[PDB]
């Protein structure tokens, strides 16, 4: 009956495509054609952080827009003070191969993970005075690509096993598993209301998940690996930067591909994607060693950061929109403003 | 202009700097190696050999030191077939150790394809490959039976003659070495098809009982370091 099921699936996919085309009366560029362009956005490297020993694979800001955690392949997880360049903590990891770092919203815990398939959650507010591994979540069958905190007790982790997980930290167990993707899930963005999250994988498809219920609501389709994903500040759109030079903006309420940010002079893959606080600027890190700032509505390039000697591997915009921190494969992070 | 607490925080940052400089010296003095191979390939045998004599966990690590030079050798388990995404973590490893079972001719062709994927990878474009054609005690016992001829799996063997080069000095059957050198050349051709800096394949013949594999790794890594010295420092 596999033929019958495949035929029904093909018919359903065609119905989805037809319905999604039936709601595409106008394109985002047509509506945006009248608003004035942003103009040259020239951001300068204010602070440069020079502590790590090897390539930086991830950063994540704190909710205070002051502290930030950076993970390097040297086995270090450095918690930096952005304003003063001071190093607040230097956690030595048990595994040197780290692909993700997460800073809890409360500022108490920080998460790391990588080839070890373990999500290591470290406690920073201990009475002992030193950072300790509070928990080691150990249920994945593939490398961790992204960890994000929901609160102090729940984490959401994307792994190379084609599955995402929602863990209760105290119990140490996977409360929920998300099992739709057909390839390695490389990125993960949590909606501001923390009830949904979009995961981009290597199947050239992003998937929107309901955390509370465990299902996959919508599947958005890119022509290569999706390496970074980031929600729009609204909570009703998101951006996916992929291995084909392209960052695409999708909208949940319409189940569409609103815009495709690409340029003929860009050939490398996007590693990181972030939005400015307003949502008007889409910052994307590239293998070309520089970050491009796109206008998220006119789909035109607005600026270039261009201050790194190796590929930009992580990008993050503070909660207050004050700065965009770029971490590349040279040890350095750069805080642009 | 800093407050008392700000000065104390700066001093703490400088102490962290000091531990980071010590960790930098430790990180530099150690050589990172990545071990790849198939399930058929004798690969845990090699880690056992260089360990004894010198869960769902993903990365397995093996310290071993040769002539006061420390080596961290990493084997990647509990991962799926596709490797194009976690292979980027190894853009800075000194050498990639590829173990290919020379005994199994049927699966040999896919071993060459895996080798080609490793060689022509945009991230390992500057990483040398130390190649171990493993399980050769099984190769001799397989080629001295006549029940499995390479021509049944590689049609070009019938027109291949051993080159006027270094035959195995000890007693070895002259067509055992022919088959061995054909397997070697099938990888050397892929290595030399697209060559660049820091990107040289060192082929070696090994077995399970061989206890000199660590020495071979040290010699090849020394040559890799010499090439990076000749290149980074502009001497070539």
């Amino acid at each position, epitope marked *: 009956e596999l033929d019958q099921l495949r035929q029904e699936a093909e018919q359903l996919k065609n119905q989805i495509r037809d319905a999604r085309k039936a709601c595409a009366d106008a394109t985002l560029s047509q509506i945006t054609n009248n608003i004035d362009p942003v103009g040259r956005i020239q951001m300068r490297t204010r602070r440069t952080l020079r502590g790590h020993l090897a390539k930086i694979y991830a950063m994540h800001w704190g909710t205070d827009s002051r502290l930030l955690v950076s993970a390097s392949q040297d086995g270090k997880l450095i918690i930096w*003070d952005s304003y003063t360049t001071n190093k*607040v903590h230097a956690i030595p990891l048990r595994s040197s191969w780290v692909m993700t770092c997460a800073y809890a919203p409360s500022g108490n815990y920080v998460a790391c993970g990588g080839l070890d398939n373990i999500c290591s959650i470290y406690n920073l507010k201990t*009475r*002992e005075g*030193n950072v300790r591994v509070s928990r080691e979540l150990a249920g994945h069958t593939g490398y961790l690509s992204c960890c994000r905190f929901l609160d102090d007790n729940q984490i959401v982790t994307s792994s190379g096993d084609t599955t995402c997980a929602l863990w209760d930290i105290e119990t140490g167990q996977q409360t929920t598993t998300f099992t739709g993707h057909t390839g390695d899930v490389m990125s993960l963005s949590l909606a501001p209301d923390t009830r949904l999250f979009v995961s981009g994988a290597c199947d050239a498809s992003a998937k929107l998940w309901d955390v509370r219920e465990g299902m996959c609501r919508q599947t958005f389709t890119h022509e290569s690996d999706i390496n970074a994903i980031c929600f729009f500040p609204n909570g009703n759109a998101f951006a996916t930067g992929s291995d084909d030079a392209t960052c695409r903006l999708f909208d949940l309420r319409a189940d569409q591909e609103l815009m495709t940010y690409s340029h003929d002079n860009i050939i490398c893959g996007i590693t990181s994607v972030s939005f400015s606080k307003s949502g008007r600027l889409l910052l994307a890190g590239y293998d070309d060693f520089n970050c491009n700032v796109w206008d998220a509505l006119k789909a035109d390039r607005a600026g270039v950061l261009a201050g790194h000697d190796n590929r930009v591997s992580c990008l993050g915009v503070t909660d207050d929109g004050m700065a965009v921190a770029t971490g590349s494969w040279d040890s350095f992070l750069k805080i642009w403003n | 202009t800093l407050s008392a*607490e700000d000065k104390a925080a700066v001093e703490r940052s400088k*102490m962290i700097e000091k531990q980071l400089q010590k960790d930098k010296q430790v990180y530099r003095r150690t050589l990172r190696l990545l071990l790849l191979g198939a399930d058929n390939s004798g690969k845990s045998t090699i880690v056992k050999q260089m360990r004894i004599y010198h869960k769902t966990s993903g990365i397995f690590e093996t310290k071993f030191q040769v002539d006061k030079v420390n080596f961290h050798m990493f084997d990647v388990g509990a991962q799926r077939d596709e490797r194009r995404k976690w292979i980027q973590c190894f853009n800075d490893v000194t050498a990639i150790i590829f173990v290919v079972d020379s005994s199994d001719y049927n699966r040999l062709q896919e071993a060459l394809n895996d080798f080609k994927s490793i060689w022509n990878n945009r991230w390992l474009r500057t990483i040398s490959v130390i190649l171990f054609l493993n399980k050769q005690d099984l190769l001799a016992e397989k080629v001295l039976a006549g029940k499995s001829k390479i021509e049944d799996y590689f049609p070009e063997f019938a027109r291949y003659t051993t080159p006027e080069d270094a035959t195995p000095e000890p007693g070895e059957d002259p067509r055992v070495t022919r088959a061995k050198y054909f397997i070697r050349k099938e990888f050397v051709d892929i290595s030399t098809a697209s060559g660049d800096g820091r990107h040289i394949c060192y082929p070696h013949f090994t077995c399970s009982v061989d206890t000199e594999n660590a020495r071979r790794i040290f010699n090849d890594c020394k040559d890799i370091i010499l090439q990076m010295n000749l290149r980074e420092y502009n001497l070539v």
Partner: single-chain antibody
Amino acid sequence: VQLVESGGGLVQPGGSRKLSCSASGFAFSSFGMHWVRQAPEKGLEWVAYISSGSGTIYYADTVKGRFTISRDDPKNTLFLQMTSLRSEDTAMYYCVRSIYYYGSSPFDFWGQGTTLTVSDIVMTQATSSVPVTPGESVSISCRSSKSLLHSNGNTYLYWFLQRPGQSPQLLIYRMSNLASGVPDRFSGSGSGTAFTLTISRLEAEDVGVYYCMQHLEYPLTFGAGTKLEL
């Protein structure tokens, strides 16, 4: 965390004595450590400070030259070598734990103290004693001769509580932040040169002497402390 100090007793004037506090239960090597003292019936007075890594040592004016502070990190013990003692140096000496980074809460833990008997941003706390009944809000205020609002943004005032017959316990750090383990009923407020601590719904087991300490510039000055009695 535990931090027990020893070495006190009778010292004839002009003598010398080594006070040693042993720290068990926390990362001693990564914490700056202070020596404070309380006279037989008086307030707290900062004595010395040895930084993490032993790279920054500060002494009080009435202490400088005579006292040498040092730490043995591997053995987890800090020593105050007191030379040429005087009658004014009699006190219960407390060893105070203190880390410094962004968000840190210095002066977290205090030792039980050693009794040693020998045979400047002035901070004023006018209320030397405030009568009170449990269940009612209290306000303890202290001023300063110099504004503590540094240009970076945070005012460096610390409110401590010393229950009868116990070591001081940190209540508020930096004039608005609540320490770890202190009830939410305590609140701190004010501006530079004027600070107020409010206890809403006062509940006994929190009566005792309240001190306010500056941390803008060394030496760290304390106050006389308001004595809340039930």
